[model samples]
Target: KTHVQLSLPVLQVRDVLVRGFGDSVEEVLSEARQHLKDGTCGLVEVEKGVLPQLEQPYVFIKRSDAAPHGHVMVELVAELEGIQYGRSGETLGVLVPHVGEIPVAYRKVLLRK
Candidate 1:
């Protein structure tokens, strides 16, 4: 009978390449690698103990040209949703358990999108 919400800021990398020539994973990964080599992508550390389950992380892309300057901000959301048992041992609603920061490699790939 209670709701829990959690959010946290991860990292920000400038000059990221968010474009791809093709839809294939290989092509996209190649472009991402190039950007990585060009020093456009970087990783930073996140705080520990704040996240619980810490399995998968998701990214939300926000691009805007009307702001102070054309820029893109990537936000990360970490959580795991699954069915849980209630007091009566019956299936309850989805529970979004907290998670830890995403891996650097995974963040790199997400920023390319």
Candidate 2:
């Protein structure tokens, strides 16, 4: 089986500090350690705030195919509120706050699990 290692939070969850994933858990750990020693991870201080008019929210979807057998349909949040599913039109998770600003925004895509 493959392994994966994750790093601790530099800030809060709403604004994830940094998360690393590699082919193996040890690789992820090693990368994190290297980044820590090189002073690259925490070099810049990320500022975070909220926005009122912006409907920006975090949505989490646990696909029906991923669920266990015999389990009833799981509804995370209200339909009208928050973000709904893109394809299935199911509700997963969401977060919308008052107006504000964010200092940094980072996005990454991993090919391997």
Candidate 3:
């Protein structure tokens, strides 16, 4: 058996190598459109919410810049109990270095307190 074939569109605009056949490719891109510029934000809806007015869906990214070399994950505990993740929604997580998979919920609760 053999699998060898590929087809998907990709374009590079300035520093951004945009590529994808996401849900809606017709949304917008290229030439003379406000959303077609790089370094511009995709905030979509900002400047009208909380955390000092930030409920407008905070999303951001950055360019590659090298950092110090000494780099370093492991867990010290075993999952034997329950979590209060049910207290909130839209939870998030990340496998923090030296710390295993961490759970993230109730984010809004902490920002205020």
Candidate 4:
């Protein structure tokens, strides 16, 4: 007897923006939330110009087995209210609404400081 199977990789991510091409946040909310839980990345024709908005969101991802789905993207953007980006001593971070700047960069395995 010969048994063969293909294992599909499951994406395990901390969080995602769930950017939909022509869909609203409400429509993509489920998809985004699911990606967070499912730990995977998603796209909708991969549009342009539509950015996310959440200020210094304290994002966290529980332990998982996949390749840390949102890991790569975390380095890209953050969910925030304000949209002001600035630099701080060789590091780049975005400004929070009235509070302060949230350093958007990181170092060595999600050790964002």
Go through the candidates in order and give each one's C-alpha lDDT.
0.26, 0.27, 0.17, 0.25
Model 3 ranges off by over 4 Å: 1-51, 67-113
User: What's the lDDT for candidate 3?
Assistant: 0.17
Per-prediction TM-score: 0.22, 0.25, 0.16, 0.23
lDDT order, best first, reads 2, 1, 4, 3
Model 2 TM: 0.25
Number of the candidate with higher lDDT, 1 or 3? 1
Q: Which prediction has more favorable lDDT, 1 or 2?
A: 2
Candidate 4: deviation at residue 94, Å?
12
Error of 1 at 29 (Å): 1.1
Among these predictions, the greatest lDDT belongs to 2
lDDT of 4 by residue, 1-113 (tens): 12111111221121323223123323233343443334242321111322333213312222122223334212222233343222112221221111122223322222121
Q: Measured by C-alpha RMSD in angstroms, how accurate is candidate 3?
A: 18.9
Residue pairs with clashing backbones, model 2: 3-25, 4-25, 50-99, 50-100, 51-98, 51-99, 52-98, 52-99
For model 4, the superposed segments whose C-alpha errors exceed 4 Å read 1-22, 42-113
Q: Say which prediction, candidate 3 or candidate 4, comes out ahead on TM-score.
A: 4
Q: TM-score of predicted model 4?
A: 0.23
lDDT of 1 by residue, 1-113 (tens): 12112122223222122212224334433443443344333333333432231222211122211121222323222222432111122111111111232323322121212
Lowest summed lDDT window (length 10), candidate 4: 1-10
